[PDB]
Write a protein that binds this ligand. Structure first.
Ligand SMILES: *[C@@H]1O[C@H](CO)[C@@H](O[C@@H]2O[C@H](CO)[C@@H](O)[C@H](O)[C@H]2NC(C)=O)[C@H](O)[C@H]1NC(C)=O
Ligand SMILES: *[C@@H]1O[C@H](CO)[C@@H](O[C@@H]2O[C@H](CO)[C@@H](O)[C@H](O)[C@H]2NC(C)=O)[C@H](O)[C@H]1NC(C)=O
Ligand SMILES: *[C@@H]1O[C@H](CO)[C@@H](O[C@@H]2O[C@H](CO)[C@@H](O)[C@H](O)[C@H]2NC(C)=O)[C@H](O)[C@H]1NC(C)=O
Ligand SMILES: *[C@@H]1O[C@H](CO)[C@@H](O[C@@H]2O[C@H](CO)[C@@H](O)[C@H](O)[C@H]2NC(C)=O)[C@H](O)[C@H]1NC(C)=O
Ligand SMILES: *[C@@H]1O[C@H](CO)[C@@H](O[C@@H]2O[C@H](CO)[C@@H](O)[C@H](O)[C@H]2NC(C)=O)[C@H](O)[C@H]1NC(C)=O
Ligand SMILES: *[C@@H]1O[C@H](CO)[C@@H](O[C@@H]2O[C@H](CO)[C@@H](O)[C@H](O)[C@H]2NC(C)=O)[C@H](O)[C@H]1NC(C)=O
Ligand SMILES: *[C@@H]1O[C@H](CO)[C@@H](O)[C@H](O)[C@H]1NC(C)=O
Ligand SMILES: *[C@@H]1O[C@H](CO)[C@@H](O)[C@H](O)[C@H]1NC(C)=O
Ligand SMILES: *[C@@H]1O[C@H](CO)[C@@H](O)[C@H](O)[C@H]1NC(C)=O
Ligand SMILES: *[C@@H]1O[C@H](CO)[C@@H](O)[C@H](O)[C@H]1NC(C)=O
Ligand SMILES: *[C@@H]1O[C@H](CO)[C@@H](O)[C@H](O)[C@H]1NC(C)=O
Lengths: 404, 68, 184
């Protein structure tokens, strides 16, 4: 008999920090003899350079595909009126120098020798602009901008379209539009308070960043390993040990460093495969239940999904899924059909319910009693082959017109 | 990459300064990505900022609809 | 190219090492050569396994798309084609698959005035599947994907409550064929 609006937070990583590693700088550095010696190993450094260029271009490709879903940048109207609904938390703040809404600002604040970090091609500013354009398109055009040119539509009309898509009639919207807007605003405030109060809400990006930092620190620390040699320093071995064996010792040291580097590259490739899988999942979710209505159950939100608001995150994306949740159930007596004048009547889209002495037809998600008529019911066969049918008369909406 | 060229057509970016390509205020479709919000293309070679797309501000109203 | 790497030895041919160098340490040299080539083979096998995982994921995605929008109609938006998907043509490709997707793209939009409902005789009328469209003087009903205006008729509209609770409603009569069919 009642419904509530709930907002859920979903966090999916998009990409990690791009890294470039040089073999001749990480292994030995400024040693000419090491540079001459590493040329006899083949093209292992070439393979490593190819692998790092590949992981960089895959990160760039997935971070371009997950965000640039539309080639048109839409802008919100200056008037912030949507029939009582409030969107100041998701809409970007003009007072912010970075043009970022306070939700994205909170998300950014909650996230804190040959090796180098490549800056991403898709930095914060155009990612925020893309999210703002997507929000404007989904708030002013609905699903029309995701299937062609953008068409203007009022927000209550979009809500009515989504309710009809999920299976709710438009009668309950206009009678409770203010209540729906107030519930949505309260849910937005509650989810903002929960996001600000729970540091574990952004756990996935936090552990991804921690794992990347730990891997980089361990790769750096692995340089100071003996690897079966007398010391981890190269020049003292070169200037102290007899070259004949010193060559064997430095060969063992550089091949141990090569093994450590290959292990690091393999782990980075596995992490990149996991990140690509997560980014593909996020892209499918964006295609399904961001640019349009999704009929899937428990795919990108608990309950009957309505829409999702994408939010920018450091090395990830956060979605604000808004769902339709029924509540306040009431007991009723149901019948498979109604036997009237020797004929069985079946509802076209409703279900027959009874409160104890009268029967009514109601929607599948909301309680709204209506008189059983011939417009919403169809006749197919008699009423004796069915099991569990009851007795009730059917009111004719046409009879009193010619009765007088 | 990551090297300041003042202590080793000049346009200093976050990743590093570019030598041989001139910066253009106008932005076009990017061809060869570089990083840090900048990239270069051949037209001589020039560099420009990101072009997200053509600006299209839809007129939103409480009683306006666009039926195809 | 991995066969041309000396791996710190004096030659890249094991026969040359066997016929050129003393066997007591030629055994160690051959052991070093074979363990270097074994490590290279292990690295290549790990790269092949990573590529196999990527290809398996791509093939699973392609099979899902073929089961979704090749053998039937898919209601998903922008899953296997931009716009309202209709169907697709599967084609054979060398080490790949090419799909010729067919989609529905609306075009040539027109500005119009809309209302949430129509208040007639103190009752609110809502469209069953369409929307109320006004061209300037009269109100019509049409689908959300095409412009097919029609006279407001009770067959495609339902009554639920009055018009005093709704917001933004306009005044217009609702045509019903019952009155002309019973007048004569
Ligand atoms: C359905 O539930 C909502 C809240 O979940 C009810 O709205 C409340 O109504 C009471 C009085 O009617 C007010 O005091 C509260 O402030 C309302 N809450 C909110 C959040 O607005 C609503 O009345 C319920 N509907 C029915 C038919 O019981
Ligand atoms: C939408 O919500 C925002 C806050 O979430 C409201 O802004 C508040 O307005 C009151 C009254 O002017 C101020 O006392 C608060 O300080 C404001 N909060 C913030 C965070 O600025 C806003 O009024 C709501 N309504 C609209 C139409 O935007
Ligand atoms: C089941 O619902 C119906 C519809 O509301 C109830 O019928 C009305 O009951 C009230 C008082 O209970 C009367 O004032 C109305 O005149 C009744 N309507 C009609 C059309 O007769 C019915 O009473 C409910 N049954 C129970 C057991 O509560
Ligand atoms: C609904 O009504 C029909 C006829 O109006 C009932 O069918 C009759 O049931 C009585 C006893 O229940 C029998 O004596 C008659 O022979 C039946 N007539 C026919 C034509 O079948 C039917 O039983 C009623 N449903 C319920 C649940 O009582
Ligand atoms: C809106 O549509 C209605 C019906 O399609 C138009 O009314 C007709 O207009 C033509 C053009 O002169 C007349 O010949 C008909 O007699 C009109 N029919 C009726 C029932 O009045 C109306 O002109 C359109 N309005 C605009 C602004 O285009
Ligand atoms: C739509 O029509 C209704 C009645 O047909 C109008 O309601 C009347 O409004 C006038 C002036 O506003 C009042 O003097 C009457 O008492 C009202 N009658 C009733 C039954 O409420 C209504 O104002 C019209 N609305 C528009 C926008 O034209
Ligand atoms: C309906 O009745 C059953 C048993 O009679 C009871 O367990 C259940 O709580 C009732 N539901 C409501 C909403 O009262
Ligand atoms: C429901 O089940 C009970 C016992 O299993 C049976 O007596 C009754 O007739 C059934 N009612 C219907 C409508 O099937
Ligand atoms: C490079 O150094 C100069 C001064 O030495 C400084 O002005 C400039 O901002 C630096 N460039 C970068 C990209 O840090
Ligand atoms: C509809 O009107 C708005 C402004 O009133 C305008 O920006 C828009 O281009 C118009 N639509 C069409 C299809 O002409
Ligand atoms: C639409 O908004 C304008 C200004 O906010 C207002 O004058 C007009 O009455 C509104 N129309 C409806 C149908 O709400």
């Amino acid at each position: 008999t009642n419904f509530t609006i709930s907002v859920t937070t979903e966090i999916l990583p998009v990409s990690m920090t791009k890294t470039s590693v040089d073999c001749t700088m990480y292994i030995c550095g400024d040693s000419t003899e090491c540079s001459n010696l590493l040329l006899q190993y083949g093209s292992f450094c070439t393979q490593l350079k190819r692998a790092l260029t590949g992981i960089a271009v895959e990160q760039d490709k997935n971070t371009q595909e997950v965000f640039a879903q539309v080639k048109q940048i839409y802008k919100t109207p200056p008037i912030k009126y949507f029939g009582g609904f409030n969107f100041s938390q998701i809409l970007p703040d003009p007072s912010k120098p970075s043009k970022r809404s306070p939700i994205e600002d909170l998300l950014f604040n909650k996230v804190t020798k040959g090796l180098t970090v490549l800056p991403p091609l898709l930095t914060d500013e155009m990612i925020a602009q893309y999210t703002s354009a997507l929000l404007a398109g989904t708030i002013t055009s609905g699903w029309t901008f995701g299937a062609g040119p953008a068409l203007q539509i009022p927000f209550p009309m979009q809500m009515a379209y989504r309710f009809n898509g999920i299976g709710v009639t438009q009668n309950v919207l206009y009678e409770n539009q203010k209540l729906i807007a107030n519930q949505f605003n309260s849910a937005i405030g509650k989810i903002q308070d929960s996001l600000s109060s729970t540091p574990s809400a952004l756990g996935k990006l936090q552990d991804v960043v921690n794992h990347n930092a730990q891997a980089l620190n361990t790769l750096v620390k692995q340089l100071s390993s003996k690897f079966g040699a007398i010391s981890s320093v190269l020049n003292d071995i070169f200037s102290r040990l007899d070259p004949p064996e010193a060559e064997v010792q430095i060969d063992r040291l550089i091949t141990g460093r090569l093994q450590s580097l290959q292990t690091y590259v393999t782990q980075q490739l596995i992490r990149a495969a996991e990140i690509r899988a997560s980014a593909n999942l996020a892209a499918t979710k964006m295609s399904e239940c961001v640019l349009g209505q999704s009929k899937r159950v428990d795919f990108c939100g608990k309950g009957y999904h309505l829409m999702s608001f994408p939010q920018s995150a450091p090395h990830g994306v956060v979605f604000l899924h808004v769902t339709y949740v029924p509540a306040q159930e009431k007991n009723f007596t149901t019948a498979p059909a109604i036997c009237h004048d020797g004929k069985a009547h079946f509802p076209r889209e409703g279900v027959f319910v009874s409160n104890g002495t009268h029967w009514f037809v109601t929607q599948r998600n909301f309680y709204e009693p209506q008189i059983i008529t011939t417009d919403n019911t169809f006749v197919s066969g008699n009423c004796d082959v069915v099991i569990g049918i009851v007795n009730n008369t059917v009111y004719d909406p046409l009879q009193p017109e010619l009765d007088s | 990459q990551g090297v300041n060229c003042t202590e080793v057509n000049v346009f200093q970016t976050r990743a590093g300064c570019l030598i041989g390509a001139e910066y253009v205020n106008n932005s076009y479709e990017c061809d060869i990505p570089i990083g840090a919000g900048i990239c270069a293309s051949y037209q001589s070679i020039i560099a420009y900022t990101m072009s997200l797309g053509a600006e299209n501000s839809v007129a939103y109203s409480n009683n306006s609809i666009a039926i195809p």
